[PDB]
Design an enzyme around this catalytic site. Structure first.
Site, short mmCIF file in Angstrom:
data_model
loop_
_atom_site.label_atom_id
_atom_site.label_comp_id
_atom_site.label_asym_id
_atom_site.label_seq_id
_atom_site.Cartn_x
_atom_site.Cartn_y
_atom_site.Cartn_z
N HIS B 41 0.82 -1.11 -0.04
CA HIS B 41 0.03 -0.13 0.04
C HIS B 41 0.93 1.27 -0.04
O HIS B 41 0.46 2.37 -0.38
CB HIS B 41 -0.97 0.03 1.13
N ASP B 90 -0.58 -7.06 1.91
CA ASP B 90 0.05 -6.06 2.11
C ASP B 90 1.62 -6.20 2.04
O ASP B 90 2.05 -5.94 3.06
CB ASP B 90 -0.43 -4.98 3.17
N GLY B 190 3.63 5.97 8.33
CA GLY B 190 4.84 6.30 8.02
C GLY B 190 5.89 5.13 8.39
O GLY B 190 7.05 4.84 7.89
N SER B 192 5.08 1.63 7.63
CA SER B 192 4.69 0.92 6.70
C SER B 192 5.67 0.24 5.91
O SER B 192 6.65 1.12 5.76
CB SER B 192 3.38 1.67 5.98
N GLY B 193 5.92 -0.95 5.81
CA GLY B 193 6.92 -1.68 5.21
C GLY B 193 7.97 -1.91 6.15
O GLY B 193 8.82 -3.05 5.94
C1 LIG Z 1 1.44 1.89 5.02
C2 LIG Z 1 1.38 2.83 6.38
O1 LIG Z 1 2.14 3.66 6.69
C3 LIG Z 1 0.13 2.74 7.19
C4 LIG Z 1 0.59 2.02 8.55
C5 LIG Z 1 -0.22 2.33 9.94
C6 LIG Z 1 -0.14 1.31 10.80
N1 LIG Z 1 -0.99 1.57 11.83
C7 LIG Z 1 -1.16 0.95 13.16
N2 LIG Z 1 -0.04 0.29 13.49
N3 LIG Z 1 -2.10 1.38 14.17
N4 LIG Z 1 -0.90 1.86 6.69
C8 LIG Z 1 -1.96 2.57 6.57
O2 LIG Z 1 -2.18 3.78 6.39
C9 LIG Z 1 -3.24 1.74 6.04
N5 LIG Z 1 -4.60 2.18 6.48
C10 LIG Z 1 -4.88 2.21 7.69
O3 LIG Z 1 -4.03 2.16 8.77
C11 LIG Z 1 -6.10 3.12 8.04
C12 LIG Z 1 -6.09 4.32 8.69
C13 LIG Z 1 -6.38 5.40 7.54
C14 LIG Z 1 -5.91 6.75 7.82
O4 LIG Z 1 -6.35 7.32 8.87
O5 LIG Z 1 -4.88 7.38 6.99
N6 LIG Z 1 -7.05 2.18 8.87
S1 LIG Z 1 -7.63 0.96 8.31
O6 LIG Z 1 -6.94 0.19 7.30
O7 LIG Z 1 -7.72 0.24 9.76
C15 LIG Z 1 -8.99 1.93 7.96
C16 LIG Z 1 -9.56 1.52 6.67
C17 LIG Z 1 -10.46 1.81 6.23
C18 LIG Z 1 -11.25 2.70 7.10
C19 LIG Z 1 -11.26 2.84 8.34
C20 LIG Z 1 -12.00 3.86 9.20
N7 LIG Z 1 -13.25 4.44 8.56
C21 LIG Z 1 -14.45 4.14 9.12
C22 LIG Z 1 -13.35 5.91 8.72
C23 LIG Z 1 -11.79 4.09 10.48
C24 LIG Z 1 -10.54 3.72 10.99
C25 LIG Z 1 -9.74 2.80 10.21
C26 LIG Z 1 -9.96 2.51 8.86
#
Ligand SMILES: *C[C@@](*)(O)[C@H](CCCNC(=N)N)NC(=O)CNC(=O)[C@H](CCC(=O)O)NS(=O)(=O)c1cccc2c(N(C)C)cccc12
Ligand SMILES: [Ca+2]
Lengths: 55, 254
Positions: B41, B90, B190, B192-193
């Site tokens: 991702h 992922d 940040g 991630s990976g």
């Molecule tokens: C690639 C990365 O850097 C990053 C690492 C995050 C690791 N997090 C933790 N260890 N807690 N990965 C991502 O950004 C992948 N997406 C998410 O983590 C996402 C957050 C989105 C954001 O705020 O930018 N959360 S999730 O995949 O759990 C997610 C997905 C879809 C919807 C979500 C909602 N909606 C209902 C608003 C709420 C909460 C999480 C959600």
């Protein structure tokens, strides 16, 4: 037997017909004569932290 | 990384820093002199594939000390089952245009064999996660590489121990939870990976990839990581193949 406590292997384990087990080591390592321990064959083997190893 | 500590320089030698046009994108894990494991991702929004850089031996982002080694990413391989915008499968395998030079500050993390990882590593309670990601939820990123020790959970125990929300991605067999639900420690955006490294009898192995989570260190939730053991064979097969023209490569999975 590999299933139970990694078959005694320090690293990888392979099961053989009967009660025959073979331990192996990741690249950059050699299996010792005890047949379970792995020893580095290079200066920077994987998964080892130099500044700590040298301490 | 939330609620962790600074990884003393040189103690996270397999940690990789991914940059796109000089900007912080994600982390990654070195598994040999030319291969880096990261998260799929991390490449969803990339349009300029020729500006992707991998930095090894990095520690402090505000200073160059000579231990850093930069390499262009010649190829980014992603499993066919990965769908942009989602979180399942992922993982991404990266080939550097030129090998890095192993040194005290640049060392690969061992990619374990599947059997070993499933019936041995998967049961080691604690493991280290690291990165220069956000220090807090909706907070600033770190200047120095941070590391955090986290406990792994059974998906089952993760499910009925987490505050069920809604539309929250499903926790599949290609993932596993690790961390705390008291809102104190977790990996973050940040990171991630980045590697989820597990220790076993004097050696460290790659068991996870920072992947996702609801917010960061959100009370009642755990961080979710890509279950690497499911991709060992897929990775080994790709590392034995000749490079192909074009940076992005989708490869069949299984
Ligand atoms: C690639 C990365 O850097 C990053 C690492 C995050 C690791 N997090 C933790 N260890 N807690 N990965 C991502 O950004 C992948 N997406 C998410 O983590 C996402 C957050 C989105 C954001 O705020 O930018 N959360 S999730 O995949 O759990 C997610 C997905 C879809 C919807 C979500 C909602 N909606 C209902 C608003 C709420 C909460 C999480 C959600
Ligand atoms: Ca630096």
């Amino acid at each position: 037997i590999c299933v139970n406590e990694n078959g005694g292997c320090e690293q990888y384990c392979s099961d053989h017909t009967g009660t025959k087990r073979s331990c192996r080591c990741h690249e950059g390592y050699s299996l010792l004569a005890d047949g379970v321990s792995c020893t580095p064959t290079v200066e920077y083997p994987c998964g080892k932290i130099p500044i700590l190893e040298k301490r | 990384i939330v609620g962790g500590k600074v990884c003393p320089k040189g103690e996270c030698p397999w940690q990789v820093l991914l940059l796109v046009n000089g900007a912080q994108l994600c982390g990654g894990t070195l598994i040999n002199t030319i291969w880096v494991v990261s998260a799929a991702h991390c490449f969803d929004k990339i349009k300029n594939w020729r500006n992707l850089i991998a930095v090894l031996g990095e520690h402090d982002l505000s200073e160059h000390d000579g231990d850093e080694q930069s390499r262009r990413v010649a190829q980014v391989i992603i499993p066919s089952t990965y769908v942009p915008g989602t979180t399942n499968h992922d993982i991404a395998l990266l080939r550097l245009h030129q090998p890095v030079v192993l040194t005290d500050h640049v060392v690969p993390l061992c990619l374990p064999e599947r059997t070993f990882s499933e019936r041995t590593l998967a049961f080691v309670r604690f493991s280290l996660v690291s990165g220069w990601g956000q220090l807090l939820d909706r907070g600033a990123t770190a200047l120095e590489l941070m590391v955090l020790n986290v406990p792994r959970l059974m998906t089952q125990d993760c499910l009925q121990q987490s505050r069920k929300v809604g539309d929250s991605p499903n926790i599949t067999e290609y993932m596993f939870c690790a961390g705390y639900s008291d809102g104190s420690k977790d990996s973050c955006k940040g990171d991630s990976g980045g590697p989820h490294a597990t220790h076993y009898r004097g050696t460290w192995y790659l068991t996870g990839i920072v992947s996702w989570g609801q917010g960061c260190a959100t009370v009642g939730h755990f961080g979710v990581y890509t279950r690497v053991s499911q991709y060992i064979e897929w990775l080994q097969k790709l590392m034995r193949s000749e490079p192909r023209p074009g940076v992005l490569l989708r490869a069949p999975f299984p």
